[PDB]
Design a protein around this ligand. Sequence first.
Ligand SMILES: N#Cc1cc2c(Oc3ccccc3OCCC(=O)N3CCOCC3)cccn2c1
Ligand SMILES: [Mg+2]
Lengths: 405, 544
Amino acid sequence: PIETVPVKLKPGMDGPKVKQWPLTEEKIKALVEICTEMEKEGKISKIGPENPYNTPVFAIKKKDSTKWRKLVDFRELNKRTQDFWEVQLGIPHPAGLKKKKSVTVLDVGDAYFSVPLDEDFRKYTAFTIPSINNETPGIRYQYNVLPQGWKGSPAIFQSSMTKILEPFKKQNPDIVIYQYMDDLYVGSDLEIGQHRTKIEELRQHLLRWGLTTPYELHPDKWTVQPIVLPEKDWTVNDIQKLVGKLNWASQIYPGIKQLSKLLRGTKALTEVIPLTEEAELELAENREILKEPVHGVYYDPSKDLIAEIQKQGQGQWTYQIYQEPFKNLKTGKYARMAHTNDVKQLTEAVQKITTESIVIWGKTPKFKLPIQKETWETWWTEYWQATWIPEWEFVNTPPLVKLWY
Amino acid sequence: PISPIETVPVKLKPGMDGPKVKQWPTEEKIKALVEICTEMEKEGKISKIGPENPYNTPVFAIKKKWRKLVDFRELNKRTQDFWEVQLGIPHPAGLKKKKSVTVLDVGDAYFSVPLDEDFRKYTAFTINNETPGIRYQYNVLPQGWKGSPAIFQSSMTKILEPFAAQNPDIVIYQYMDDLYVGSDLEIGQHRTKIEELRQHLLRWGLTTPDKKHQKEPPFLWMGYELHPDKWTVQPIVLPEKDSWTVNDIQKLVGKLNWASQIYPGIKVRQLSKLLRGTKALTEVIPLTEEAELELAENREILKEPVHGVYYDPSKDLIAEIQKQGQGQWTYQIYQEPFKNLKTGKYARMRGAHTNDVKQLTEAVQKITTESIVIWGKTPKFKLPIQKETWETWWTEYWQATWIPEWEFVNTPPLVKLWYQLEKEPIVGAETFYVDGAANRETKLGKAGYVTNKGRQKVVPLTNTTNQKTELQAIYLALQDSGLEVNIVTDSQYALGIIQAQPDKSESELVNQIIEQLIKKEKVYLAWVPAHKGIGGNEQVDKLV
Ligand SMILES: N#Cc1cc2c(Oc3ccccc3OCCC(=O)N3CCOCC3)cccn2c1
Ligand SMILES: [Mg+2]
């Protein structure tokens, strides 16, 4: 049909040679059903041994269904092509989407399967269905059509996307529309039910132009969340953790400092101590200084976004998005409502956090995950319900910060 | 025995040309060469070429009858990369039993596959008696060349695609130049299907064992012994030496690892600790007492041979983990109470301080991975740890982790929590303030305390570091304390070590602090900013 847009690699860069993760037998059989159909639809073709590239493949479940989906970790092929395909074809980020009182997210990646992928570039999309126990070297495919997850796939289809949206966009001058990867983020100020109709409008519009589509947000509740000083009717130990947190906080927000005095001399720990005027005065002065955020904190579009999470117990987790230590762009908490495996909670946490990042800044962060590397590389594919995958790595050493947040 | 198979196209690495490494005079070899050249030309495997300014690569000749050799090193450096042939191996513990299993080997496996046409020029080798330079050029996959293992495996795979759909009841494994075929149909039907396939292969070009299928069990395969119903490692000879070298201690700990898969109970901890002097390869390393004992316990295990069973998908998969000590654990995976599928060990400490539950969590992990690679599933875990033990651990662990469904097994030593700190300070129990310091220069230090009840101490410390003192400072406050102590430190470091609650550590001091902590009955460590005049700390910081 269409002409294969000429795809190139950032010069002097070779394609991905990521090793395939071993898979359970349930998951392999699903990738073998799925690819057998995708090969019948001509979407992907078998490939010879003269193709040395590989990127990994996982098997997840779509929203909640008995349907097996397929997921591809184009994170390496992205860093190698798209960093050039996001300038030669870049889709700009609307910086107001975070303002709108509601946002819904739509899965449009069925679009890409219409477009053929450049002939000379297909070799870089190779993947491998692994065998059990190295019985066979895997089954080897490369893509023939725009593959979802690649970041040049929405970039190529960008033109056709704005066409299909131009009627709806002009009839609704008040609705924000952002396409990140295979997702449309549609933001508006309607009350919910009308926001939902104007959604089903856009749904039905897109559906009747050939684009089939299968998560309600509210970014005006999001705020850099401040520091809570406890409310106690106070021992020596309480005034210690009070001096301790307050000292760490003073490293970022200038202001708030004498409290110690109310503990001068070698008191016992569980010695219930009273409250001094100058101390309460301090405490009050500190509490206000906290409520008030700081300045200097500006997103740097050249700098990567770094997300840290801590497990806080009883299902609570907390996170800080930043690019410079102590200079914290976004800060939030998280807690699901049962069958809440610690790892499910992290998966949901990470997915929530990257959406907030996609919405605000239109780039995903890199995660410092509080989890063993191999444990994550095993049960991450279980609760993963997203088309994309952030970068990540694994931290081993949070000293006192669990209390401090 | 050339083939009509489709060739796989091959390119040189972009912006490279083909090799030109001139040879140099071996009258008896030079002759042998001519003999193989024409006898291989007759089979079409190579062809003479008229020097049209083509390339070149060396070639040699060595008696084992003679044999020919080519140095392709300069060509492999210039040809493109291929897909990785087989980075791993099938583990026998994961094979499915078959009634009969036939082992075939294809001779000339590389010489029976055609090499691409446009890529043929770059293989030009030449065989000073003004030698006429009888220029040749390969036509099949040359032996040694970068692309042969990958391409041959692919050709072999396609050559098999008709036969495996015609006879879907038999199972073939590919491994380099071998085929392992195994059926559950009658042994007369077997000899027949084998004979069909051999002749099918030969219609493509692939010669196969004549004397029946030849290989009769037990099979000596990749350092295993495969018996028709048992698998076991090939036999192991641990040397007996007066002196031990790095080469010798690595070869030893290779052999010991190779055996850990089926001989339960192996340990290699204190042996590989020796390898931290990895500085050289022939440097003599004196054994230690724990090492020479360990190698002695390993000898006791190997003296009687034990074996492994195969996989039966219809029977569940089970895993048991038992504690050995000094951060060492063994596991067994079985379907049946006495028949092991395989065994193995976990000893990694992941740092210098670990506890028993964590090391057991890490172990389970290593097994889940290994189970998934081998059998494609995860096992049911039988674990020497109460539920009350683990629940309280991971609910308070700062890291996230995933604990599979497991059944408790009482067979000591059960894993336990030898102590818990309090989460809140102890009423009316003595609260030691502690601190310590050591002039890095003087490398000298002191550890002291100052309590609410008015007690104060300072101990002199020689050959220490500012870190090592602020742990003695905690040590002291423990050994000078009641069974309920509130200790309080300025040291972010020593707070960190303790709060992880290690039950095992490779520090002498930290093992002593552990022992005291076990003896105590309510400890509670709290932390306050260093040099922040919080009151009391200024005292422990005046002294010390
Ligand atoms: N030499 C050698 C050799 C043999 C095998 C091999 O056998 C099989 C081939 C096809 C299907 C099932 C096969 O095993 C099934 C298990 C089985 O009952 N066994 C009995 C003795 O023989 C080895 C194993 C598999 C892999 C590598 N192999 C390497
Ligand atoms: Mg000090």
